[PDB]
Amino acid sequence: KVFGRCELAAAMKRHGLDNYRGYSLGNWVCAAKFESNFNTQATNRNTDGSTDYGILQINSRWWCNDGRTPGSRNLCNIPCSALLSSDITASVNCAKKIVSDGNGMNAWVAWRNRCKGTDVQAWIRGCRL
Ligand SMILES: [Cl-]
Ligand SMILES: [Cl-]
Ligand code: NA
């Protein structure tokens, strides 16, 4: 599924992400825009043989099992295919574990380079929430 901007903001808010560990809703929408262009089916392979999955590009070396990343943990205890569903619930639950692990949203490279320090509230302006 390819979400619209306000559609995703509302789904993320309903799943408990607004101000989760101090990160306002705009941060999460901005991160999804630049990681996946709001597409739940996005995948991208990395040099080390791991693959990133879904709306928040969650990585197979640490967080999900895809059966082809040898030395990998499966810390969210899900198959990586579950992160490509049009229901974002599995992605959100796993994102909450990642952002709590000490490094906050710096785990998402696009957030660090394209959202951090910017006016992220712009990403939810105009939306009925
Ligand atoms: Cl915000
Ligand atoms: Cl933090
Ligand atoms: Na894994």
From Swiss-Prot:
Class of this enzyme: hydrolase
Pfam families with a match to the protein in the record: Lys
Entry's localization field: Secreted
Keyword Signal assigned: yes
GO cellular component: cytoplasm; endoplasmic reticulum; extracellular space
Major place of residence: secreted
Domain of life: Eukaryota
Residue intervals of the C-type lysozyme domain: 1-129
KW Zinc (keyword) present: no
Tissues and organs where the protein is expressed, per its UniProt entry: In the egg white and polymorphonuclear leukocytes.
GO biological process, one term: defense response to Gram-positive bacterium
InterPro entries: Glyco_hydro_22, Glyco_hydro_22_CS, Glyco_hydro_22_lys, Lysozyme-like_dom_sf
PROSITE patterns given in the database record: GLYCOSYL_HYDROL_F22_1 (PS00128), GLYCOSYL_HYDROL_F22_2 (PS51348)
GO molecular function, one term: beta-N-acetylglucosaminidase activity
Annotated disulfide bonds: C6-C127, C30-C115, C64-C80, C76-C94
Binding residue positions for substrate: D101
Keyword list, A-Z: Allergen, Antimicrobial, Bacteriolytic enzyme, Disulfide bond, Glycosidase, Hydrolase, Secreted, Signal
Active site (catalytic residues): E35, D52
Primary role: Lysozymes have primarily a bacteriolytic function; those in tissues and body fluids are associated with the monocyte-macrophage system and enhance the activity of immunoagents. Has bacteriolytic activity against M.luteus.
More about this protein: Lysozyme C is capable of both hydrolysis and transglycosylation; it also shows a slight esterase activity. It acts rapidly on both peptide-substituted and unsubstituted peptidoglycan, and slowly on chitin oligosaccharides.
The protein's assembly and partners: Monomer.
Family as reported in the entry's similarity comment: Belongs to the glycosyl hydrolase 22 family.
Protein name: Lysozyme C
UniProt organism field: Gallus gallus
Classification of source organism: Eukaryota, Metazoa, Chordata, Craniata, Vertebrata
